[PDB]
UniProtKB/Swiss-Prot annotation:
Function: Cysteine protease that cleaves viral polyprotein and specific host proteins. It is responsible for the autocatalytic cleavage between the P1 and P2 regions, which is the first cleavage occurring in the polyprotein. Also cleaves the host translation initiation factor EIF4G1, in order to shut down the capped cellular mRNA translation. Inhibits the host nucleus-cytoplasm protein and RNA trafficking by cleaving host members of the nuclear pores. Counteracts stress granule formation probably by antagonizing its assembly or promoting its dissassembly.
Lineage of the organism: Viruses, Riboviria, Orthornavirae, Pisuviricota, Pisoniviricetes
Catalytic activity field: Selective cleavage of Tyr-|-Gly bond in the picornavirus polyprotein
Disulfide bond residue pairs: none
Subunit structure: Homodimer.
Catalytic site: H15, D33, C104
Protein name in the entry: Protease 2A
Binding site for Zn(2+) 1: C50, C52, C110, H112
Portion held of the full protein: 869 to 1007 of 2193
């Protein structure tokens, strides 16, 4: 679990979005596993605007943060779940690192701010849904 709170928006994994998220829907993209909903309270997370390929992510299944090198956002094949059939997930960045399904939502951050959130994993890899291209989150 986990979310990013920026201005009047909450960014979550689309597969973990709640009824309140879908009733206050701003934007969603199944191909990215992202959903953004509106909030009443103001958020203070800073979104990174950069091409960093190194950062730190939170891993809830280890109660730890790990430093990683990650790939640039791209289309990557992802196995089926109860949420999606097998498909290419877009804007996904991969790194070598531990993850489990409940780790989705953990933040990846560089020195500039929030880069994205854990969205996939398996076989010792972890994948993060990028948010740095969503320039509208700041206005
Ligand atoms: C962090 O995720 C995991 C890690 C290890 N084994 C499995 C997982 C779970 C996983 O990959 N999922 C969860 C359901 C949505 C899927 C998607 N984005 O299409 C990804
Ligand atoms: Zn950066």
């Amino acid at each position: 679990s986990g979310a990013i709170y920026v201005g009047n928006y909450r960014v979550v994994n689309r597969h973990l979005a709640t009824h309140n998220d879908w009733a206050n829907l701003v934007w969603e993209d199944s191909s990215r596993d992202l959903l953004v909903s509106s909030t009443t309270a103001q958020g203070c997370d800073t979104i990174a605007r950069c091409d960093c390929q190194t950062g730190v992510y939170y891993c809830s299944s280890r109660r730890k943060h790990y430093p990683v090198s990650f790939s640039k956002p791209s289309l990557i094949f992802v196995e089926a779940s109860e949420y999606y059939p097998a498909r290419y997930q877009s804007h996904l960045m991969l790194a070598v690192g531990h993850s489990e399904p409940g780790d989705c939502g953990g933040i990846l951050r560089c020195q500039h701010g929030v880069v994205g959130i854990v969205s996939t994993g398996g076989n010792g890899l972890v994948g993060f849904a990028d948010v740095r291209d969503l320039l509208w989150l700041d206005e």
